[PDB]
Design a protein around this ligand. Sequence first.
Ligand SMILES: OC[C@H]1O[C@@](O)(CO)[C@@H](O[C@H]2O[C@H](CO)[C@@H](O)[C@H](O)[C@H]2O)[C@@H]1O
Ligand SMILES: OC[C@H]1O[C@@](O)(CO)[C@@H](O[C@H]2O[C@H](CO)[C@@H](O)[C@H](O)[C@H]2O)[C@@H]1O
Lengths: 651, 651
Amino acid sequence: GPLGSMLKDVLTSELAAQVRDAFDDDRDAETFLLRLERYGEDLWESLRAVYGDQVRALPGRLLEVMLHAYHARPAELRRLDEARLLRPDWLQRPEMVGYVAYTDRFAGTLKGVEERLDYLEGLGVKYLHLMPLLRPREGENDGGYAVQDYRAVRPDLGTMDDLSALARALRGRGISLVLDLVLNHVAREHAWAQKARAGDPKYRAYFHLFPDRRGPDAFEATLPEIFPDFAPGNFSWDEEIGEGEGGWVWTTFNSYQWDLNWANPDVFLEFVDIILYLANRGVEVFRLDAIAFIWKRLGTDCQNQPEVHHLTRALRAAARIVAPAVAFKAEAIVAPADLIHYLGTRAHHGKVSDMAYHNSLMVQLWSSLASRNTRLFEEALRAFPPKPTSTTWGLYVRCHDDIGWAISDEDAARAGLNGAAHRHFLSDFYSGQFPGSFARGLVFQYNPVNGDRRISGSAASLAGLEAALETGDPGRIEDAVRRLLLLHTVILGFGGVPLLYMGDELALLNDYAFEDVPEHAPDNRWVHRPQMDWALAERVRQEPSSPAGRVNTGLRHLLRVRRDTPQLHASIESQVLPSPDSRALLLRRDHPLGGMVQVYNFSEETVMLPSHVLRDVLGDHVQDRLSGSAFRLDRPTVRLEGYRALWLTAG
Amino acid sequence: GPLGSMLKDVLTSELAAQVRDAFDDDRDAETFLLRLERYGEDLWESLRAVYGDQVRALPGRLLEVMLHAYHARPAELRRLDEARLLRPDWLQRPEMVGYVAYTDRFAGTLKGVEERLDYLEGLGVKYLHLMPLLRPREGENDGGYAVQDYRAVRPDLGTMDDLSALARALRGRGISLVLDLVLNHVAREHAWAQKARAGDPKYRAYFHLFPDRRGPDAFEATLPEIFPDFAPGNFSWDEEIGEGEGGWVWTTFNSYQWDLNWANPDVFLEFVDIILYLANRGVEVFRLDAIAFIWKRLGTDCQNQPEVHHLTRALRAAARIVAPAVAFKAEAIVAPADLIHYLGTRAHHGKVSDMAYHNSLMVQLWSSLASRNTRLFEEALRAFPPKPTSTTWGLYVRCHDDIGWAISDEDAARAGLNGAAHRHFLSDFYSGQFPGSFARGLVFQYNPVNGDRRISGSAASLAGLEAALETGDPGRIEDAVRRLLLLHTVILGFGGVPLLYMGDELALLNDYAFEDVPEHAPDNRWVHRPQMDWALAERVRQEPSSPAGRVNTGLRHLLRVRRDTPQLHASIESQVLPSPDSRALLLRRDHPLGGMVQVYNFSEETVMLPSHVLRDVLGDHVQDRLSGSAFRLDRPTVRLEGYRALWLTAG
Ligand SMILES: OC[C@H]1O[C@@](O)(CO)[C@@H](O[C@H]2O[C@H](CO)[C@@H](O)[C@H](O)[C@H]2O)[C@@H]1O
Ligand SMILES: OC[C@H]1O[C@@](O)(CO)[C@@H](O[C@H]2O[C@H](CO)[C@@H](O)[C@H](O)[C@H]2O)[C@@H]1O
């Protein structure tokens, strides 16, 4: 009513006054204010939902950080901001293609990356995700995920000026730089944590600290264990915490990764500042690492609490008021219905993030390759609510992490499977324990208490090439190559930005030499984080008939077809077309110029697919975009040899 | 290759040079240039597709017009431009609601409109389409569609400054001004046509002129007749054309409406200038009148030629490089597959328009109300390809025009009907010739050659209220009120901006006094273009139980529910859910927070709908957004009384 109204009035005019006072140039003030009007309600309501009445003390400090970032934003990045506002579906274009790499493994240093831009460009890459490259702690550092200083580049990669000069050279090729925002935890060596241990109460309040086992024991009753092999539980003992003998600190991941206290608005402020600082160095997309973990609540698994989406929305709104070019990409492993909350709900609240990993597509790809059965695939896809049309999936076959078999009991039961049995089969199969498995993966984080296993291994070793090369059997080598190409066809055709993992285009195998690096030995994820093989890159260019060569040639052809296929616009979602044959997966994409049906054989066997399931959708005459040829769907069957993919449209 | 490349290089740099030379302020030059980069390819490629090599001589003249419009654009409309770029889905929000009115009929003058803004705002209107208000020819002028001067307001409505002050007052209420761009033809009294008749060859070349019957006869062989009753055929004889005895001029519509020659790029230039001039007066959306007609080609019906979409795309691109707030709305009556080309194709060419009338929804609403059968409705909807998700339908129950029964033989045959028979039934039914019809419409443009009929009449008279009031039968009055509300429920729920026709909220009946105005008498469309009844508006506010009052109260309730229903976001399209009962129409809308099924009974009879068709989609427990109550879909049937609507979501 009036009392509440009047207070809100005073606040608005205080916000307006601080913005106008900050700009000598009135167009800038007007621009800032329009952005604040567009995103203000998402920013403040989200902040009040997490921080309650405290928020009222927040605007001056937060607007201070944003106003300065705005003044500090280079003219060329202001122009990028306008360009992105003019093309809001930029991530959704079929020409978009991503590439994911550790700087040091790909090209040694940031400047070395600049020397490989013709390689990325020759692949049609337009989105480059470099793995965490901020200064990490010395020694073991979870491959850069234990960050010591967010304002410096790891010194052996270069400097913040190299990062900025790299991003400028990327833009000159139409490539977007994409980096991790490691916002859930910092290295125990970060100055925040050093000061908490020295006793500074401002910085003790950045962490979740406990004098004894009571708090920790009470949380642990409902918490899972993420890295049982590295650091049991979710709390670590540290001698230097407090005045006396130490204390317990929350450490979800490694002991040297201290979870940040997101109930403290100072932490929110620090990360606004980090985001805007990195955006002004040229970062265009932020992958929100471990985003699900940022809110703790007693009695829950401390993942996916509602505050996570409020904080994410506020962080984004603050960022884009300053730098509208910036997009956010959530990585959260959660049930489909919940995953959609990381993107947006197309309701009275604003968008939460621009992209999210489609982890369930990745899991089903490997699951169906192992089982030769696509019914679980169909049911896992069918469980998703639709995303907002303006958001975009990131699709992948592999990445820097092990694979967890995130398959729901509910989807599995709809496909006539027991979930637990199927999940157990997938780890037996991909660790190579199941007889006749083609896969060569390593068990990661076996958990004795519950029997949970994840799998490490590169795409080529999981898909059969490492085993096929050992045998020297030409039929095994052929099938491994075809599986690798089928995997990459699905992520290229599914709708979303396909995120090629460095070297998958060369079919790189497990790197068992990680055991010989003490910093890596305990963590077998490093098996699928190889050095780039540039000699191999040159050999496949000159000799395309080898198995690496055929994966390379094949992937490059698929990339060219993807970019010329308008039906792949990511505003449209693939829908399951129920298959009459359990070896095949049929996906339909409706599009203004005519539908597409993508057809995939997940078996080494020749499937004679009954034609009517396709004819009913596309009519009697179709073209396959992938081979260029025709099919007549008036014949009774369509012949799909092992691992065949088709992208059919009418004609 | 190189020769072609080098020429394109020189052109680009000449375009860049002219833009930089034009701005003293470098941010403005950079902004202009970014927009030119974003839309240039759509602008020039579309122009070359229509005008070929001529286009090469075009940029300087076209950039001249755009550069000046950009300098002339008021700061507040530049801010509107930025606001719209920040909220690109602004037309798609469930809170959007449109209202369509003749200025003089609604409030007398432009300044009179400003006096009724509380009325529009109390309705939640956010989009105001005023009917053609540019200076028309004196006398009969097709209700403003015979424009004499695009740069002046009809003097009895006010001036261009009043139009601008009106638009500013609209923005202050969050209302977008929407006007017709009458781009296909001008009044024979327009200075262009006066000069063509005086002999100026520049202006003769703005029209399609013929010395004798040879050209006209050759075109007529494949042309339909739009207004057989007003002006036969598509050509008129004019004495003053040429030096000798006159000549033939192309006149699709009235004899006094001369079709513009869009094969002349000077005409394209004139309309860029008109659009940007009107955008700088505050116009936000342009309805492209008669857009289908703008390209003539011998041997075709001269509607919907490919050049129409190229010209429309170029016109839009030129407009939004200057004024990104501006959106275009196509009105074309064509097969579904073709209608989608007025919007966009989500391929390598840019968007053609932001909105298009969904004329087939309007036709099916009336068709099913007459037949009590929804199978044709289902099949007509099912024939549409999907629109680009970033475009928006405009939905309506009635408008300023008669109704043509645009029902395809193909949809009709899929519903078990003969198209020609059904179309003949609809004109018998709505002219009130069919025994027991509740409708009181008038035949418009009966065509003796082929028997084509269209229908004039206001919503309330077509839906039965005029006949019900004559009888004084309370059951007939009840049914007419319920039909009116059901009609408006469907357009409010369908997805898109509902375009309320002035006075439909008061249930205005046919105005038979049009026969007493000589300018109107021959054109019975004026029967459904009444004066606003402000006395009635005041009575229903104070006495809501009358039939007008119940339509009013009912519509206002539906408007409030629409705006609080996130599932109505126009990025999502309604899909047919096949109905087991031919009296009912079921539409499904998938949405991130959970699906909706809208259920409509198109019969006066009580339908006991089998529950499983709904339970299968939403589960056992639902809420109806329209009445607030619950249903249990585990019971065997759901009871729908006559004309019941439900908007069900899970719960
Ligand atoms: O533990 C969460 C699983 O899901 C993640 O994607 C993030 O939540 C993976 O964690 C991420 O974070 C950890 C800690 O920084 C790092 O080891 C992973 O590489 C990173 O992706 C984690 O496996
Ligand atoms: O003749 C075309 C039918 O479709 C239209 O929507 C436009 O093409 C209607 O025409 C429009 O234009 C004529 C001529 O200006 C005018 O009489 C209509 O009111 C207008 O909507 C036409 O009936």
